């Protein structure tokens, strides 16, 4: 028992003992030009560690400057910490791949002794929240609201066997890579999605196309205006003064709700009495929703689709505008079409910011240009688009759980990696024992029991 439950094999050693050198850095005389002028050697500020891994340097610091200054040259593959800036006393960490670099007073270069301690191991170790708690024990303190290098040295950290430290570190490293990997795919998918948006809508699946009033389009497709296909409805708000309207149970969706996103429900709701007297327009499910006010980025459009099971339906305010399909149409397809940027440009070109602005006139919407694909094709396009969106959501969720997994795993491994057992492999004549999912676990259990029994021979085995 010590900082935390610690295993037999390990010892809690101070960082100072384990570390070859712990020292601060200083600040150069800014006034002198010569120090900065024409500088070869990168100079780093506190911001550098905070932003990403340390590949890049915001400022530049000359060697003349280096000579006249406490600042020294740090080695590559070295851990770095930022004294200032934190929740009164955390400290930031980073690794420097690029050639030996220098820093200022806030940064503290730290070097691990060879084979004594790994840089990778330490970096994760400091990163751990447990690390944060340890420092917080000091408190904000008076006049020293930072992490004193002296205090840093005192720190007690457990020390694993050299072999295990590499293995443990590697495992964490892979996990970090994985999150990065998923992130990369994640970024790419909306880029791809964006491409489909333009191509699918205009191009459609066909191959034979002709010239059209609205850009090049498929031959099969036909052209019509919004008014032809859909009907536009305008809307008014209830008087705030009457509380009768206020008691509710029926949704009324304002632009703000639209900002939220897909809308089954709304923050404020309006009563049936209100609908009848006011003669508000009720909307059935699967209807299209649009934003009439606060413009957006000026004259532009916003959209949303109402959700309902046979349980509910939605009504909205003046700020919003509704569209109802006469028939042959797929609402999801149209919704995506509106939000498309192509629509944004066309609307903007037709109407520039004018007195009527930050809003769309009914005439404008009706006159709007739109393609009319066949019913089946529309469904196919819509299904594809919607599915892609779902995929993006799923990946996000996957990332979240993975992150959680790391947290859980880190907790266990910190203790377990710390046991000597981790260095040693489980006793097994054949590798097959581990291979089976269940078998591996069984082997582990047997080894543990046997080892403990052998340990029983001397108390010291367990005790140490």
């Amino acid at each position: 028992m010590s900082a935390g439950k610690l295993p037999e094999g390990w010892v809690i050693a101070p960082v100072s003992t384990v570390t070859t050198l712990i020292r601060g850095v200083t600040y150069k005389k800014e006034q002198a030009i010569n120090y900065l002028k024409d500088d070869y050697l990168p100079l780093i500020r506190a911001n550098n560690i905070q932003n990403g891994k340390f590949d890049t340097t915001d400022l530049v610091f000359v060697p003349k400057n280096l000579v006249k200054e406490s600042q020294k040259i740090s080695p590559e593959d070295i851990v770095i910490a930022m004294s200032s800036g934190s929740k009164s006393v955390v400290g930031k960490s980073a690794h420097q791949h690029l050639p030996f670099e220098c820093s200022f007073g806030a940064f503290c270069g730290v070097l691990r002794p060879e084979k004594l301690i790994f840089s990778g191991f330490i970096a994760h170790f400091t990163k751990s929240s447990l690390y944060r708690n340890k420092i917080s024990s000091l408190s904000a303190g008076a006049n020293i609201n930072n992490i004193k290098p002296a205090s840093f040295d005192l720190i007690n950290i457990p020390i694993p066997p050299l072999a295990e430290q590499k293995i443990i570190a590697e495992k964490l490293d892979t996990l970090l890579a994985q999150v990065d990997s998923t992130k990369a795919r994640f970024e790419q998918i909306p880029q791809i999605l964006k491409r489909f948006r333009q191509a699918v809508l205009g191009g459609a699946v066909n191959g034979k196309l002709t010239e059209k009033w609205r850009n090049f389009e498929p031959q099969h497709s036909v052209f019509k205006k919004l008014n032809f296909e859909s009907i536009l409805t305008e809307l008014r708000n209830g008087l705030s003064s009457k509380p009768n309207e206020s008691g509710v149970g029926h949704p009324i969706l304002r632009i703000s709700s639209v900002r939220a996103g897909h809308v089954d429900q709304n923050d404020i709701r309006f009563l049936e009495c209100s609908e009848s007297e006011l003669n508000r327009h009720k909307l059935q499910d699967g209807d299209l929703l649009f934003t009439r006010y606060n413009g957006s980025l000026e004259f532009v459009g916003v959209c949303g689709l109402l959700k309902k099971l046979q349980h509910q339906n939605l009504l909205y305010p003046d700020k919003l505008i509704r569209a109802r399909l006469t028939k042959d149409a797929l609402p999801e397809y149209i919704e995506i079409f509106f939000s498309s940027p192509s629509a944004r440009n066309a609307m903007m070109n037709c109407v520039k910011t004018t007195s009527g602005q930050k809003g769309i006139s009914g005439k404008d919407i009706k006159s709007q240009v739109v393609l009319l694909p066949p019913v089946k094709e529309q469904a196919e396009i819509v299904r594809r688009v919607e599915q892609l969106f779902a995929y993006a959501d799923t990946i996000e969720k996957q990332v979240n759980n993975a992150l959680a997994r790391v947290n859980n795993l880190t907790q266990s491994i910190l203790a377990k990696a710390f046991r000597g057992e981790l260095t040693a492999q489980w006793r097994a004549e054949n590798p097959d024992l581990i291979s089976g999912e269940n078998s591996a676990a069984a082997l582990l259990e047997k080894i543990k029991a046997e080892r403990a029994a052998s340990g029983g021979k001397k108390a010291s085995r367990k005790k140490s």
């Binding site: 408190s139 904000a140 008076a142 006049n143 609201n145």
Partner: protein, 529 residues
Amino acid sequence: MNNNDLVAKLWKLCDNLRDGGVSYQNYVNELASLLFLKMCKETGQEAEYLPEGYRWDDLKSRIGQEQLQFYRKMLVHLGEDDKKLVQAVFHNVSTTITEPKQITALVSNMDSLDWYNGAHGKSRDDFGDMYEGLLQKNANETKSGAGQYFTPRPLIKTIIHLLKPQPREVVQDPAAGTAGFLIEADRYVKSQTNDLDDLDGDTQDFQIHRAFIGLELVPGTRRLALMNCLLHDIEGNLDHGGAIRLGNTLGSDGENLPKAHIVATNPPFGSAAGTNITRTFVHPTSNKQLCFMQHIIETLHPGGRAAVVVPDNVLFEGGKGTDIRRDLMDKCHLHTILRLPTGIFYAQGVKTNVLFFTKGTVANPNQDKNCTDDVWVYDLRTNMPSFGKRTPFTDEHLQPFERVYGEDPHGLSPRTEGEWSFNAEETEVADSEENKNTDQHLATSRWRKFSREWIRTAKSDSLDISWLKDKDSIDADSLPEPDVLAAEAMGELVQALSELDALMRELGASDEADLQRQLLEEAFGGVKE
């Protein structure tokens, strides 16, 4: 006492001041001057109060610029002479009128006014009273900036009620303002001695000339304050102009002020006005409020007592703020802290408290260290009704606190944690050191005590002690006792409840306590596992 026919009549005159260049903040000041001169004439002995050549007729008879210029010279001539009696009332006094047609319209307007609010005999008192009330409306108005020196009447009453000033006790106010605390302290003393009639002439003289002392930086305000005491029969010391002295509490004047048995004050918030700290304190600071605290600790006689209205900063400020707070709890016996609501001040986005403490201890009036032991805090802020002109802050809101406080002015009356007013039981409990190892019932009390060692350790010597969320949400209140005890635990336990509700919906279980208990029995236990 409320504004009446007289207040409305005084208001109409301010229309001339408004359209004369005068601000809403100086209305009363402008009116008081003119009214005084007018009243001296009505008295029929102006010859005894004002100097020849500078009386009501000399001003009232003139017109236009000839009048504004004469008025100026008159304001200066009166505020400078050996007849310090009247001089006190016009010292550093000047008009802010610029429109010559407006002054002519004003003087003649009130010249034809009544004793409308009057009474048997001249009701000079009434004019002053109305004057104060009108001033309050201004003090209350945002645009004016007057709000700086405004303190909820019910707060003043309460503060003096808990200090219980006795005759022969010197009551000081470092930030007198319009002398609100002093007037109230005097009123309280008179209400316990038949207006001084229960006391021998000598003690009466003490109460009239030495019992109350104030200090105000802004000469304009000090003037109003001087008129206030004067009509309240508080003469103070003629050497300094009266009960309220003119000067800087953080300057030479501050240390030249006489010690005191009692101190009730509401020093300025923010960085204050033009007040340079040209005085050395036990712990030099930049903050103006922490300087006042050091002054208040200094002037108090051994065994003295005080009630000081302060901002949250004083409680949680670091650097030198910690040193001064440790100094306070060393040299004084801080026993009670009242955390006030929000929106009770003409300001708005501020947080204020009232510290109650004794200089040294009742047993050892001269103790230099470890005077503070247990500090009682009363949360009258979190989860409180949004105060405003709609929701007024009254004496009713302070009665619970004054009850638990005790009847002893040194806060030595027996006390026991436990006060759940203003829906304290329905307020969200915070998960912090304060509520550590605290049972469900206490963690929701607005009245709790904290030890010196605890404040030292847990709070690192910070008096920004808080322990209720008073979340504004409606949730069923069904929980295990252990769940309630651990505030932090609630999140985990509550999470289990969320899933339970979903299952219950499918079940269609009725809304009954028994049903909830049955489900909780299994679900609750599972979490424990």
